Amino acid sequence: LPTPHEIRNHLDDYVIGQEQAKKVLAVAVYNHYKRLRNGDTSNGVELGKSNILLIGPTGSGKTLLAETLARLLDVPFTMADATTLTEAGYVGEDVENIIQKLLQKSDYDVQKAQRGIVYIDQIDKISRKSDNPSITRDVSGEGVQQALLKLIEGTVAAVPPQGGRKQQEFLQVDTSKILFICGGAFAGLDKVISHRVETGSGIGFGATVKAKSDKASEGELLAQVEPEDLIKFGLIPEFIGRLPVVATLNELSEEALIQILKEPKNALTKQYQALFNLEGVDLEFRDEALDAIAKKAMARKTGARGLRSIVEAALLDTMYDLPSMEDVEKVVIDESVIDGQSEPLLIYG
Amino acid sequence: ALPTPHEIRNHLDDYVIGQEQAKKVLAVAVYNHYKRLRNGDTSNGVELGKSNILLIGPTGSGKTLLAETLARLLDVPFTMADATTLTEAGYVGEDVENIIQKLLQKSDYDVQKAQRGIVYIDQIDKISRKSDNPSITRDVSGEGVQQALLKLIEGTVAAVPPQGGRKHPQQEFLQVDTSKILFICGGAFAGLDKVISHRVETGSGIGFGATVKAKSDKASEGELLAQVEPEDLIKFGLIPEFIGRLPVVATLNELSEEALIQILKEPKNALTKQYQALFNLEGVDLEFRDEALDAIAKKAMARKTGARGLRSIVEAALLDTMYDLPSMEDVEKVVIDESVIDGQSEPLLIYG
Ligand SMILES: Nc1ncnc2c1ncn2[C@@H]1O[C@H](COP(=O)(O)OP(=O)(O)OP(O)(O)=S)[C@@H](O)[C@H]1O
Numbered sequence: 223l224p225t226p227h228e229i230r231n232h233l234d235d236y237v238i239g240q241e242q243a244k245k246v247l248a249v250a251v252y253n254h255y256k257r258l259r260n261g262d263t264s265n266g267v268e269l270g271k272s273n274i275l276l277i278g279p280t281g282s283g284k285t286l287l288a289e290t291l292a293r294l295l296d297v298p299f300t301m302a303d304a305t306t307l308t309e310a311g312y313v314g315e316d317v318e319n320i321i322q323k324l325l326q327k328s329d330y331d332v333q334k335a336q337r338g339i340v341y342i343d344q345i346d347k348i349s350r351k352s353d354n355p356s357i358t359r360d361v362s363g364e365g366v367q368q369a370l371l372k373l374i375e376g377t378v379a380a381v382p383p384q385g386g387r388k389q390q391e392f393l394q395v396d397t398s399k400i401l402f403i404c405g406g407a408f409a410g411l412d413k414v415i416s417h418r419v420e421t422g423s424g425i426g427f428g429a430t431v432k433a434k435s436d437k438a439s440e441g442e443l444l445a446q447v448e449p450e451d452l453i454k455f456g457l458i459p460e461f462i463g464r465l466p467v468v469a470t471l472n473e474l475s476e477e478a479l480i481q482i483l484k485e486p487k488n489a490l491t492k493q494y495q496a497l498f499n500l501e502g503v504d505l506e507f508r509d510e511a512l513d514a515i516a517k518k519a520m521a522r523k524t525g526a527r528g529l530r531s532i533v534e535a536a537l538l539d540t541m542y543d544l545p546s547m548e549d550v551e552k553v554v555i556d557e558s559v560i561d562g563q564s565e566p567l568l569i570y571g
Numbered sequence: 572a573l574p575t576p577h578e579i580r581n582h583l584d585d586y587v588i589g590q591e592q593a594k595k596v597l598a599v600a601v602y603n604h605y606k607r608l609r610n611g612d613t614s615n616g617v618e619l620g621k622s623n624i625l626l627i628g629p630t631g632s633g634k635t636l637l638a639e640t641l642a643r644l645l646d647v648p649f650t651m652a653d654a655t656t657l658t659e660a661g662y663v664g665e666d667v668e669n670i671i672q673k674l675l676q677k678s679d680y681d682v683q684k685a686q687r688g689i690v691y692i693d694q695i696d697k698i699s700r701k702s703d704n705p706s707i708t709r710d711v712s713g714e715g716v717q718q719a720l721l722k723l724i725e726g727t728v729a730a731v732p733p734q735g736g737r738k739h740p741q742q743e744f745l746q747v748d749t750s751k752i753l754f755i756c757g758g759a760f761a762g763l764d765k766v767i768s769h770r771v772e773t774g775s776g777i778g779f780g781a782t783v784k785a786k787s788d789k790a791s792e793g794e795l796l797a798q799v800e801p802e803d804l805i806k807f808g809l810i811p812e813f814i815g816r817l818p819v820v821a822t823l824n825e826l827s828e829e830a831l832i833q834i835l836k837e838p839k840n841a842l843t844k845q846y847q848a849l850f851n852l853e854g855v856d857l858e859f860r861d862e863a864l865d866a867i868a869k870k871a872m873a874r875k876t877g878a879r880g881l882r883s884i885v886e887a888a889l890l891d892t893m894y895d896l897p898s899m900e901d902v903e904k905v906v907i908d909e910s911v912i913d914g915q916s917e918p919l920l921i922y923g
């Protein structure tokens with residue numbers, strides 16, 4: 223009997239600064255369990271299913287949320303990608319590949335698989351290139367979206383169980399109850415949102431001028447997104463209609479990174495702490511060193527994923543002579559070490 | 572007795588609202604189909620024709636909804652196939668014959684009982700060549716799939732494996748006549764309004780003599796479909812042969828502002844009744860006043876996504892409420908005012 227507060231508390235341990243995103247998942251997860259729990263033999267018939275669309279900046283933690291969810295989730299979960307999908311039975315891949323991947327996690331249990339959750343990454347890769355209907359067939363893009371429409375609403379797709387032993391049959395897999403979380407970092411969406419959010423004005427004398435968009439306000443700008451803007455970006459309205467809900471993720475700032483290095487249990491700081499714990503050596507991270515990493519992380523425009531480059535670059539010299547070194551019990555990383563002027567202080571004990 | 576067009580439509584009215592034109596067309600075909608089968612066919616009139624239906628309507632107008640509601644009341648077997656996965660010449664994707672075997676699963680492998688079944692093919696527009704494309708490579712999911720359905724719709728015998736085959740020992744197929752099978756092929760066509768305008772607008776008019784069309788008040792999209800003809804679809808990509816097999820057409824009359832309000836209250840499967848049951852098990856009931864729904868209708872039409880895009884308006888409001896509702900105790904009723912939809916205020920909570 224999980225609750226949004228309990229599930230959010232668990233997710234909060236691994237994610238920070240995504241209060242709006244977390245609420246959406248908690249409701250769907252809570253409602254999905256509630257929907258399946260219901261016998262369906264009641265006044266409410268064919269209860270609706272709310273899908274989710276996770277849009278956010280690069281490296282903001284979208285892919286991480288789906289991974290952490292599967293650990294806590296009891297029902298099966300699968301994480302596919304739309305990069306390999308090709309329409310019309312081409313050589314690349316078919317959409318049915320997503321369903322068979324779910325059974326691998328579910329051990330080929332049809333009744334248990336229909337109640338599963340699905341996640342897709344890099345959904346923007348199939349958006350039309352800001353054009354009108356094409357003059358030719360776009361195998362990857364407009365074509366792929368057309369195929370997913372019926373899958374999201376609910377239908378049965380042929381799937382060989384285990385790939386087939388040697389049977390010549392396929393197992394029907396309902397999808398009316400399956401939830402879908404399609405999310406990927408869209409590029410350039412702010413420029414499109416800027417045009418629509420801005421009222422617009424005529425350049426002549428009589429036409430009034432409107433002073434707006436003084437600051438980019440990226441995080442606050444994506445919140446004003448609507449389906450009509452995505453149509454101009456390349457998505458088909460049919461595909462978005464299948465995804466009523468949407469999630470806007472703020473971009474992490476200098477202060478957000480500091481909390482990510484200490485509060486989460488799987489933080490990189492704690493990883494190295496365990497790396498040296500087995501070696502009989504302790505590790506420490508002072509606040510002055512984390513402040514400098516934040517400024518360097520933003521300088522590389524890579525997000526949280528670009529943080530390891532800064533850490534490994536500093537501890538490189540240390541890690542080269544640490545195993546051979548003996549009688550060392552503690553390592554401290556100061557602010558100077560990041561700049562490279564100094565070396566990390568080692569204590570012998 | 573037999574089901575009547577008026578009686579069958581009343582059943583559909585419970586699940587569909589504002590589609591009087593479409594309901595009648597479907598009722599007649601279903602009644603005609605039952606009539607043709609009921610008839611022995613060994614009479615003066617023979618080789619009776621089958622009138623197929625072609626449903627053209629915008630997204631979320633209720634095309635897919637009609638097929639599901641029909642199968643519930645319909646006694647004969649029904650299937651919901653799609654032309655998106657079909658590939659011609661037996662390629663690796665899928666074959667057109669797959670539609671037939673799916674029908675038998677509902678019919679329990681009864682050939683005589685299967686020919687009288689009904690089929691609904693969605694996403695039919697997605698297999699049309701748009702225009703002026705490279706001819707070095709032939710279309711596999713475009714111009715080449717419609718050709719395969721021509722013989723199927725007109726009536727031919729297609730080999731089908733029985734149950735997929737227990738082992739190689741059988742190595743046999745089943746022959747199923749399809750001349751009697753009905754086909755309802757419909758999908759939301761994109762960009763059809765632009766081609767129809769060229770024929771019925773003739774108003775670029777930059778010269779003195781030519782007129783000006785008074786642009787921004789003539790884009791009557793829904794009404795524009797009402798004047799559709801087969802020649803317009805040829806420019807869209809459909810082959811005349813495929814259209815000849817589908818004489819009937821049914822404009823959908825997509826949506827009226829007031830229709831959306833009726834869909835949320837009168838239907839049994841309305842969204843309002845869904846959430847009402849969602850909280851009913853939790854010992855909580857929520858009411859939606861009419862003053863709140865009028866604002867919701869205006870927000871949905873602004874999104875240009877149809878009824879399917881309506882949940883976005885509801886869940887965006889009730890997000891914070893549903894997140895902190897279980898933790899709350901002694902709460903028996905919730906009221907949602909117009910302000911809640913706007914976001915200025917919060918939904919009032921009642922304590923028992
Ligand atoms: N809030 C966060 N707290 C802790 N680690 C985070 C956070 N956000 C991102 N990360 C780190 O970023 C890694 C990858 O996050 P992702 O979910 O891939 O971000 P992303 O924006 O989804 O990148 P994409 O989807 O591949 S473009 C995780 O394994 C974490 O190490």
Ligand SMILES: Nc1ncnc2c1ncn2[C@@H]1O[C@H](COP(=O)(O)OP(=O)(O)OP(O)(O)=S)[C@@H](O)[C@H]1O
Binds near residue numbers: 371631637758834878
């Ligand atoms: N007349 C209607 N009355 C009630 N609900 C409707 C009506 N029309 C559409 N809906 C809602 O819209 C949902 C989907 O409608 P569809 O039948 O899928 O429309 P559609 O034309 O098939 O869209 P496509 O072709 O699948 S993109 C239904 O499940 C209903 O919730």
